Amino acid sequence: MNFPNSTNLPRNPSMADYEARIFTFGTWIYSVNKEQLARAGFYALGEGDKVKCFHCGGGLTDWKPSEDPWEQHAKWYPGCKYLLEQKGQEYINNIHLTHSLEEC
Ligand SMILES: C[C@@H]1CN(CC(=O)N2CC(C)(C)c3ncc(Cc4ccccc4)cc32)[C@@H](C(=O)N2CCOCC2)C[NH2+]1
Ligand code: NA
Ligand SMILES: [Zn+2]
């Protein structure tokens, strides 16, 4: 509902540290791995498996075990500068092509 942050500055700098993001999950019952989530820049909101990226502020939910944090981050928040710093544009293009092709 809010626009995604495409600047090089994090929307939520309180969640910029991996350890800070890790704390937000607590006991995590969900199919997708919390450390893998925190590495993809995601922190938990405390309602179901709702996560937000610390940098773009981009929010995701209803994590199937087939869904990957970095892939979902790229699918839904392609303009995220954190995503770009960590993964690079070669990775990001693959994800886009793969999912844009996945539709068939
Ligand atoms: C891990 C994947 C994510 N999918 C996309 C998803 O989660 N998106 C896409 C988008 C950007 C339109 C969206 N906007 C709002 C919410 C809620 C929200 C609000 C603040 C914080 C976190 C979550 C979620 C969401 C899931 C997906 O395909 N979904 C179909 C649509 O409804 C959500 C599930 C499947 N799992
Ligand atoms: Na929790
Ligand atoms: Zn992001």
Side-chain angles (χ1 to χ4, degrees):
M1 294 212 283
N2 221 306
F3 75 98
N5 164 44
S6 311
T7 81
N8 281 289
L9 296 167
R11 192 165 271 168
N12 189 353
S14 81
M15 291 292 123
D17 300 315
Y18 169 84
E19 292 287 321
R21 298 194 295 278
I22 269 295
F23 290 129
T24 67
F25 295 87
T27 304
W28 188 249
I29 64 152
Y30 297 109
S31 65
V32 163
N33 186 277
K34 76 168 168 205
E35 13 293 293
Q36 197 159 268
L37 284 165
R39 276 183 257 118
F42 296 112
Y43 61 97
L45 295 176
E47 50 180 321
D49 55 6
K50 288 208 189 186
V51 297
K52 259 187 153 78
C53 171
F54 88 88
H55 202 278
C56 59
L60 292 178
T61 203
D62 301 331
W63 289 93
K64 289 136 236 176
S66 87
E67 293 171 333
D68 174 70
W70 279 122
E71 295 197 8
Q72 296 301 306
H73 202 156
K75 187 187 211 159
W76 294 102
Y77 306 98
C80 173
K81 290 312 208 296
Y82 179 72
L83 162 69
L84 175 56
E85 179 190 52
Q86 302 299 311
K87 301 307 288 187
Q89 204 62 28
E90 289 161 80
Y91 179 86
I92 308 175
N93 288 327
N94 176 279
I95 291 313
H96 294 319
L97 294 156
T98 299
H99 274 107
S100 293
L101 177 64
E102 234 153 33
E103 286 183 317
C104 83

